[PDB]
Amino acid sequence: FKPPPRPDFGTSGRTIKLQANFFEMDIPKIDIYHYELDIKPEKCPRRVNREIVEHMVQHFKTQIFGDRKPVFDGRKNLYTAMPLPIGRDKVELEVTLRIFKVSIKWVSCVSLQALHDALSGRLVPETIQALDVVMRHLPSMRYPVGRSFFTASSNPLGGGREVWFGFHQSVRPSLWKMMLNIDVSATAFYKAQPVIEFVCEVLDFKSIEQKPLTDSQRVKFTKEIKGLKVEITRKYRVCNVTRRPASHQYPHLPCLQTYLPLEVCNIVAGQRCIKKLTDNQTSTMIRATARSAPDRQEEISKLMRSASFNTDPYVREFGIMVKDEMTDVTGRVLQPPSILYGAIATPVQGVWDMRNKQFHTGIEIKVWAIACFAPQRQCTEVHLKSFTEQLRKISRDAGMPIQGQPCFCKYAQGADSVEPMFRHLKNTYAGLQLVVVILPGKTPVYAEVKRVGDTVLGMATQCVQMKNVQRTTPQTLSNLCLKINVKLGGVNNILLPQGRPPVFQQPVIFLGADVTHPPKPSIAAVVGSMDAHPNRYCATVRVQQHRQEIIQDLAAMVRELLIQFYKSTRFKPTRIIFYRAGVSEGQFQQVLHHELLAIREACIKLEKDYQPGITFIVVQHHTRLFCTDKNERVGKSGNIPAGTTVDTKITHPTEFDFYLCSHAGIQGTSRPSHYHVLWDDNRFSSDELQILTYQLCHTYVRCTRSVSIPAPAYYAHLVAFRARYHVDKEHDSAEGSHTSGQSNGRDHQALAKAVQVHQDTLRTMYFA
RNA sequence: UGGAAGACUAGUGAUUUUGUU
RNA sequence: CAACAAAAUCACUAGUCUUCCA
Ligand SMILES: [Mg+2]
C-alpha cells in the first residue's frame, strides 16, 4: 500500500562534510502569468521562434510588450512577471528579420504561493514545468541546439575542429524549498575560418603555397569541411566538396560547391558540430577532456559563478534568485563487515585480497579435465601444461587442492563438438568434478558449452580466454578459482557472526531479484539465501513477457527458495528481506502492490500459520556528489570514499530513502546507488537497515571488492545473464521461420525447460 | 569469457504542456 | 478523470567505445 514514512535520519557512522551540485533558492511568491502563442510557419525551429518573439517585442514595444522580458518555451508556452494588454481578444502580429506571423492569447497564472503551500502540504505539481521553462530561457540563446548556457571560449582537435564548453541544467524539489542543479555536458564544433587557414592548418603542406591533391590530404579538409555556412571575408551554404580542383571543376586545390575559391571566403562562425563523427574523432576530444570528479566540481563552481544570473535585470524580471554556492550536506560512513575465511579481512576502501586466505569449505578436486578449442599451434600442449601448473598452484594455495594431472585432454573444433566429448567424459570417468574449457575470443561455442554444462549433463564447466592461458597471471587464476570453488558447491567466505545487527539474530532469508530485457524473452531471476551467514544463494529464473518489469511468477520462486531453506536448515525464516533491482520510478506503486503480496502468498503456501516480517527495498542518474574536505579526496579519481550514505537535504522529504556509494570510484565520478525502502514490516531503524544493505554488498563471491548494488540483486543479474547464455535455435540453425504469434508459446516452454538447471547443478552456485 | 567501474548510441515506462478521442 | 500522437524532463534497460585491479 503506501510506502512507509522515514522512521529517522540515522546516527551511525562517521561525519563528513559533502557537497552536492544542487543549488539553493529564494523562490519569490509572485504569480507568473502564462499565455499560449501560435507562430507561423510552424516548421521553424524553436530558437528561430524565440528570436522572432524577441524581434516582435522590440518592434511592438510601443503598445504591446513595452520593457517586459518574456520567456518562451519555443512553440506554445510564454511566461511573464506582469500581465500583458493582449488579454483576452485575438492578437496577431508580423515580424520581419525571413517573414513570420505570430499570435498571442492569455492562458492562466501559475501561483508560486501554491508552490509554497505544496512545499509544506498537499502531499507538488504546471508549477514545476513553468519554473523549468522560466529558469533557462535566456541562457539557452547562448548555446539553436540545446537549452543550456554556453561560454564563448583555441583548441584544434583535428581536421579543422574545435571544442567549446557548456553545462546542462535541471530543477528538482527537495526539503523546505526547490533546488536548481547544473551538470557539465559539452559538445564539439567544426572550425570556422578563412580557407587560407584551412589550407595551412588542415591541408598541412610545407607552407601556404599546391596541386591536385591525393586522397588523404583531400579528405583531411575537403571531407571534414562539408556542412558549414560561408560568407565573404554573401551568405552561402556548402553542399559539396569536389576532389577535382576549381581549375578542373589557389584554385588548383580541391574546392567547395556554384563554387567558391579558397582566398576570399570565410566560413561562418558559431556553428556547432551537428554531425556524428568518425571513430577516430571519438577519442580526439578525450585526449584533452579526460577529467575526474574534482575536474567536474571545480568546473561547475567556476562556470556557474561566471554566468552570474543574479546580476542581470533581464533574468531578475521574475525575481528568482539562485545561490552561488552549491548544496552542502552531511554524510555518514557505514562500517564494513568483517569477512571471515576458513582469517578475518576488513573491506578497506571496498577492496580486500586473498593473500594468505583460504575458502571456508574447500572442495578437493580429484578427477578433472580440460577441453581446449584454441589452435594447437597457437595453444600447444606445453601451454596447457603451464596453465595446469598455475591453476593447480593457485587452487592449492586457496584451500581447494587440485590433485594430479588432468584425467582427460583433447583438441576439438566446431560448436557441436562440445556435446559428445563431455558426454563421453561423464561416460568414461566417474566423479568428474571440474571441466575446464579454453576458447579464443568471442566465439559462439561458449554458449553451447554452458548449454552442455548446466542444463543437460550437469557438470561444473569453466571457460577461460586463449589470451589468459597464454598470459596467465596470479590475479586471473585466483579470480577463476574463486568461482570454480562455488561451482563445486564450496563456500568461499562468510560474514562475521558477531558483527551483524539484531536482524541476523533470528532465522532470516535475504531474497533478491533482477530482470533483464532483450536487445525476445525477458529473463527475471530471483535468488535466496540458504544458510544463516549467508554465502550460498540458490537461484531460480523465469522467462516472461517482453519488456515486462513485474516478476510474474515470484510466488512459486519464493516457495521453492523457502522449501530449500527449510530443508537445508530445518527452520522457517522469521524475517524476509527482498531487494529488487531494475525498477523504474514510475512503477513502484505497482511493484509494491504486486510482488510483496506474492511473497506473502508464498508464506501462505509454505504453512497455514506462518507469518514473517517482510522488508521490500528497491535499488537504482545525474545526482553527483563530491567531497568538501581536501583530506577526504580518495584515489586518482578523487571520489567520495566507499560506504558513504546521504539521507538529508537532497533525498525525498517524507519517504524512507537514501543514497549510498558502496563501490569505490575507479574512474570519473561515481553514481551512488539510490535505495528507496518501499516496505518495512520489521520496523528497522535507519542505522540497522542501512548497515544491512551496505553489508550485503560484501557477500559477492566472484571478486574480493565491494560492489555497487547488494549481492542478492547482482546475483539475480548474473543468473539472468547466464540464462541468456543458456536456447534460441532459430539463429543456431541455418534458417528459422514459423507462424509467429502462437509458436512463440512453444518457444517459451522450450526456454522454460532449457533454463531448468540440472539437479546436480541446481544445488550449487553455477551462476558465479 | 578473471573481475569491477564511467563516457557516447538505441528501446520500455512515469509525469507537465500541446493536438485528437 | 483516462488512452493515442508531438515537445521536454526523469528512471530503468540494451549496444559501441573506454579506465583500473597482485
Ligand atoms: Mg540488471
Residue numbers in the entry: 23 to 119, 126 to 151, 154 to 155, 157 to 174, 176 to 185, 189 to 244, 247 to 270, 277 to 292, ...
From the paper:
In eukaryotes, AGOs typically associate with ~22-nt guide RNAs, including microRNAs (miRNAs) and endogenous small interfering RNAs (siRNAs), to form an RNA-induced silencing complex (RISC), which slices RNA transcripts that pair extensively to the guide. The guide RNA also has four regions, known as the seed (nucleotides 2–8), central (nucleotides 9–12), supplementary (nucleotides 13–16), and tail (nucleotides 17–22) regions.
To capture fully paired RISC without the target being sliced, we used a catalytically dead mutant of HsAGO2 (D669A). FLAG-tagged HsAGO2D669A was expressed in human cells and loaded in lysate with a 22-nt miR-7 miRNA, chosen because it catalyzes slicing faster than any other guide RNA tested. The final map had a nominal resolution of 3.3 Å (gold standard FSC 0.143), with the active site achieving a resolution of 3.3 Å and the N and PAZ domains ranging from 5 to 8 Å in resolution. Our map revealed the centrally paired, slicing-competent conformation of a metazoan RISC, thereby providing the final snapshot for the four-step pathway of target association. Specifically, the first alpha helix of the protein (α1) moves by 9 Å to widen the central channel. Furthermore, β3–β7 move by ~10–12 Å, together with the remainder of the N domain, to make room for the RNA duplex in the central channel. Indeed, in our model of the slicing conformation, the 3′ end of the guide and its binding pocket within the PAZ domain have moved ~63 Å from each other. More broadly, when considered in the context of the series of changes that occur over the four steps of target pairing, these changes at step four continue the monotonically increasing separation between the MID-PIWI and N-PAZ lobes, with widening of the central channel.
